[PDB]
């Protein structure tokens, strides 16, 4: 029960993700999932 | 330019995104992008 979804991002955003992930010793993939869970927690909380 | 990167999501996460996106009149793709923007801003800001 796992699927790969494509997210279309401009190069500026991609580079922001890469830089941020490295700083926190994470992969860009982790960073995106963390982003998703954080935003979902904020929407679902209400 | 533009790049497409694959995010590996389990079905529970995929359905949560779909449900929440519909509730806010958006697509799952938009929601993921918004999540990214919001998280990056919080990550980049000085406290």
Curated annotation (Swiss-Prot), chain B:
Induction conditions:
By proline, autorepression and catabolite repression, and is potentially nitrogen controlled.
Q: Which domain of life is it from?
A: Bacteria
Summarize the protein's role.
Oxidizes proline to glutamate for use as a carbon and nitrogen source and also function as a transcriptional repressor of the put operon.
The record's family statement is: In the N-terminal section; belongs to the proline dehydrogenase family.
UniProt subunit comment: Homodimer.
Provide the protein name: Bifunctional protein PutA
- Provide the species name: Escherichia coli (strain K12)
Full-protein interval shown: 2 to 48 of 1320
């Amino acid at each position: 029960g796992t699927t790969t979804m494509g997210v279309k991002l401009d190069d500026a955003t991609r580079e922001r993700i890469k830089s941020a992930a490295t700083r926190i010793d994470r992969t860009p993939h982790w960073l995106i999932k963390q982003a998703i869970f954080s935003y979902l927690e904020q929407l679902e909380n209400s």
